[PDB]
């Protein structure tokens, strides 16, 4: 059944962007239930090895996701880690999450999905995912997705050197055991470690920890990143969650990178998308997905 589902999702590769793929309710529920098993069978704090391609927010922009695989290499030619925010804001959240869940089931050791702040019932109820489920399917299916999202892993460390999560650091985060001990399924709380990991942001102007303009969690400064990296013998923090004009954006010299993989974010920004390639030597390079925006003089 999986191969049929993937095949139908990929059928629109040559189509004009916007064309839907309408799976059956039972098919989508199957993707959620089977992938949920895998998420719980794997660590909540993933330990991954290069080569790997790391992608940021997608936000239901399915045709940009297809271009992302087209340029990066469709699974399993490349290994993928996504940093969350698969639904909401875009018009095709369902096709996006289904293709990602489908590849997760087909290639469970070479394809990984982290939880973003929009993989939360209380958030994606608000910014479009519920609306899409209600329109194209029903509410019970949206609740089924919530059951799946509640089991997603929260962070990943690549070859003991690159720490990856959707949002950022936490003032409560002192030992990696604090992440491993989080039991699933779980909702995202209004505050605390799990909240901060998916909601906090870096800030060039804060020294230490500051209040976040979102009304949730904190901001952290460059010294926080430096202290964190030296403490855990890490080299780079890779996160998402914020739109960046070039698709990637460095912070604290080069100790942190923000990735965003949805070009022309909900048609309100002119940003490009990017993904980061890490080879077996841990060299990091960026690939850009950008939307569309000497001569001798004459003689007498």
């Amino acid at each position: 059944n999986l191969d049929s589902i993937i095949g139908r999702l990929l059928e629109v590769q040559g189509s004009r962007p916007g064309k839907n793929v309408q799976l059956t309710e039972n098919e989508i529920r199957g993707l959620c239930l089977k992938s949920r098993e895998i998420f719980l069978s794997q660590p909540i704090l993933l330990e991954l090895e290069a080569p790997l391609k790391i992608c940021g927010d997608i936000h239901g922009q399915y045709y940009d996701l297809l271009r992302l695989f087209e340029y990066g290499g469709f699974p399993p030619e490349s290994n993928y880690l996504f940093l969350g925010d698969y639904v909401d804001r875009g018009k095709q959240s369902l096709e996006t999450i289904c293709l990602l869940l489908a590849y997760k089931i087909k290639y469970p050791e070479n394809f990984f999905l982290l939880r973003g702040n929009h993989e939360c019932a209380s958030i994606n109820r608000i910014y479009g995912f519920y609306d899409e489920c209600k329109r194209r399917y029903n509410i019970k299916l949206w609740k089924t997705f919530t059951d799946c999202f509640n089991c997603l892993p929260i962070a990943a460390i690549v070859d003991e050197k690159i720490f990856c999560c959707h949002g950022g650091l936490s003032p409560d985060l002192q030992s990696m055991e604090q992440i491993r001990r989080i039991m699933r399924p779980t909702d995202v709380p209004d505050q605390g470690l799990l909240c901060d990991l998916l909601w906090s942001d870096p800030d060039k102007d804060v020294q230490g920890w500051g209040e976040n303009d979102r009304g949730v969690s904190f901001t952290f400064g460059a010294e926080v990143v430096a202290k964190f990296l030296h403490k855990h013998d890490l080299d780079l923090i890779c996160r998402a969650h914020q739109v960046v004009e070039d698709g990637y954006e460095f912070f604290a010299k080069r100790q942190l990178v923000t990735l965003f993989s949805a070009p022309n974010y909900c048609g309100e920004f002119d940003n490009a998308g990017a993904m980061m390639s890490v080879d077996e030597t841990l060299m990091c390079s960026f690939q850009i997905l950008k939307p569309a925006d000497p001569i001798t003089p004459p003689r007498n």
Partner: protein, 206 residues
């Protein structure tokens, strides 16, 4: 083959970021690892461009000394001299002019020269405009009229002069009315017309 159980950046990525923020030693390290300091990214952005926009005089001098193409135009046709002029950065203009900048180079759009891109709304305009205005007027006059070729050229007419990159050419007649964009010049006893935009006041760094 599954994936479930020190890190670096691309040298080109380090170079472009370090040139914009001002970490000289990092630029020096990146330059040694990569093969070409003038390497542009997917957006046409080069190391020297970021240094000019970032006003990092230290990095600009290093890259020029390291042989960065002082005339590479970006996707918009802007050369390093054009960006320095738009920022009224006289110091960079001097470094570029003194190291092989094409004084009469023009952009692909509207075909304007660096002098015309000085921003009268930013500080330092008068200092930058005066330098560029005098530099344009001094070519074929300064250094006994000697100018340095920046590219190879194969004559397109019998009354034109052929030359290779790096050769010194003497400008004899500048304000010739019959040709406003070419100069009557002399090279190894041969006289002929040469295009203004192919010469700089000093030679490239090779």
């Amino acid at each position: 083959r599954s994936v479930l159980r020190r890190a670096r950046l691309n040298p080109l990525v380090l170079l472009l970021d370090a040139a914009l923020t001002g970490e000289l030693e990092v630029v020096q390290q990146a330059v040694k690892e990569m093969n070409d300091p003038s390497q542009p990214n997917e957006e046409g952005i080069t190391a020297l461009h970021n240094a000019i926009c970032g006003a990092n005089y230290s990095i600009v001098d290093f890259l020029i000394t390291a042989g960065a193409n002082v005339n590479s135009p970006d996707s918009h046709g802007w050369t390093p001299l054009h960006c320095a002029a738009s920022c009224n950065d006289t110091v960079i203009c001097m470094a570029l002019v003194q190291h092989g900048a094409a004084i009469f180079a023009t952009t692909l759009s509207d075909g304007a020269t660096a002098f015309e891109k000085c921003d009268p709304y930013r500080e330092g305009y008068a200092d930058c405009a005066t330098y560029l205005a005098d530099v344009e007027q001094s070519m074929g006059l300064m250094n006994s009229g000697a100018v340095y070729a920046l590219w190879d050229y194969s004559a397109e007419f019998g009354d034109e002069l052929s030359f290779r990159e790096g050769e010194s050419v003497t400008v004899l007649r500048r304000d010739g009315p019959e040709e406003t964009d070419w100069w009557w010049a002399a090279l190894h006893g041969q006289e002929g017309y040469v295009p203004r935009n192919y010469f700089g006041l000093f030679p490239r760094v090779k």
